[PDB]
């Protein structure tokens, strides 16, 4: 049961999506015909339908912190929030993602990796920020030429995020594109970046 939230909203961590008792059981989810709370920050969720179908029928579920805020990101700023993902008249963000930006005027090249040791496959989501102007790009990630590299044994993307001013949606001209994969046991997923990576915080083992 998702109430006013979509699968996107529930699985990404929309603050207005307070479905947190989770569970391991339904076969079917639930949605409204036109859910109001999904991707609060505008952008494109890659393979949405495919996720909804693969997310139908879960026998065992749990939400765990794949990259914990306090220990995983020492060289970067993790406080990024938006007035588009607002919770109680107060700018917030996705609960299962982290908006990494610069700390002390730098964005150092990062390299993070998670080895699946849960016997079962873990659902990993992330994002890539596409700023509306080069100024925001420079202000946030301290480079003009960013790369985001998500690599596993069944998935391999080499992102080159581009500046584009898009029509204002939810008061924003910038976009965060949403991506996901299923990580099989024994496999290890490696994130590498120098900007624009909305990093995963919580994943899902099903």
């Amino acid at each position: 049961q998702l109430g006013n939230c979509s699968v996107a909203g529930w699985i990404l961590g929309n603050p207005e999506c307070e479905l947190l008792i989770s569970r391991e059981s339904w076969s079917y989810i639930v949605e409204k015909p036109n859910p109001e709370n999904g991707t609060c920050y505008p952008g494109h969720f890659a393979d949405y339908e495919e996720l909804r179908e693969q997310l139908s029928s879960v026998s065992s579920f749990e939400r765990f912190e794949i990259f914990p805020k306090e220990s995983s990101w020492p060289n970067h700023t993790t406080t990024g929030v938006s007035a588009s993902c607002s919770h109680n008249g107060e700018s917030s963000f996705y609960k299962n993602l982290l908006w990494l930006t610069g700390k002390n005027g730098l964005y150092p090249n990062l390299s993070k990796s998670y080895a699946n040791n849960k016997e079962k496959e873990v659902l990993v989501l992330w994002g890539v920020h596409h700023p509306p102007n080069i100024g925001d790009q420079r202000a946030l990630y301290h480079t003009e030429n960013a790369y985001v590299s998500v690599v596993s044994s069944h998935y391999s993307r080499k992102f080159t995020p581009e500046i584009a001013k898009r029509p204002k949606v939810r008061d924003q001209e910038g976009r965060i594109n949403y991506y996901w994969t299923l990580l099989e046991p024994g496999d290890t997923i490696i994130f590498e970046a120098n900007g624009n990576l909305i990093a995963p915080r919580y994943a899902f083992a099903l």
Epitope: G80, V81, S82, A83, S84, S91, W99, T101, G102, G105, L106, G135, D136, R138, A139, L140, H142, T143, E144, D171, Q172
Partner: antibody
């Protein structure tokens, strides 16, 4: 803690080129915009241009043809060159740091917080 | 592209007085305006960024306000040190334009 100092000649002959250097102390050129501003005597401020630490430039359209701003990370310095100078280029020239800042990523603004002491340049024969 | 216009050009106020000076943008700029204080023979000093944010090190008697096209710099209790030319500056787009300046004279 960070301080800037303009260096270069005070007198420059007409048609020749003005060359000013700014030296950064108490900090590094890393990740900021580095700009030049000038002020003719009794005449308010005119932005010349800036350079971003990665090399990118942005100049004032009224000077675009004559101006070259360069940065030298090797020596904590950045320079101004203004070609074919005329008496209209007689002014006090300032180097300054333009930094980006924000309280939340939804609102990202710039400002020039660190200024040099200004160097006086006269174009005369 | 954005022209900046200050008002008034010059004014004289007494010590203790509340002085307000205005900056105007030719087209909207929102909160992308900065204020500077220039004292004779010194470089310009940043007072307020983002239209209303007081810079660290600046006395709290300075306040910035406004959004869109019309802005105001306010000194709650004028002090003799505050004798200077005051400039507004837009940070909205290139080529970063300044106002023409307001000359604050102290009346005694």
């Amino acid at each position: 803690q960070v301080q800037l100092q303009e260096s270069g000649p005070g007198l420059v002959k007409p048609s020749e080129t003005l060359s000013l250097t700014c030296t950064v102390s108490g900090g590094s050129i890393s990740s900021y915009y580095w700009s030049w501003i000038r002020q003719p005597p009794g005449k308010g401020l005119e932005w010349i241009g800036y350079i971003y630490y990665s090399g990118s430039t942005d100049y004032n359209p009224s000077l675009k043809s004559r101006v070259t701003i360069s940065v030298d990370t090797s020596k904590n310095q950045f320079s101004l060159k203004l070609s074919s100078v005329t008496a209209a280029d007689t002014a006090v020239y300032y180097c300054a740091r333009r930094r980006s800042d924000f309280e939340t990523v939804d609102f990202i603004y710039h400002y020039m917080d660190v200024w040099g002491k200004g160097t006086t340049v006269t174009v005369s024969s | 592209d954005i022209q900046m216009t200050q008002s008034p050009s010059s004014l004289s106020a007494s010590v203790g007085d509340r002085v307000t000076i205005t900056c105007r943008a030719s087209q909207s700029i929102s909160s992308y305006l900065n204020w500077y204080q220039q004292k004779p023979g010194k470089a310009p000093k940043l007072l307020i960024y983002a239209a209303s944010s007081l810079q660290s090190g600046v006395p709290s008697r300075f306040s910035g306000s406004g959004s869109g096209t019309d802005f105001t710099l306010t000194i709650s209790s004028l002090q003799p040190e505050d004798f200077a030319t005051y400039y507004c500056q837009q940070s909205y787009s290139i080529p970063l334009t300044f106002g023409q300046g307001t000359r604050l004279e102290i009346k005694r």
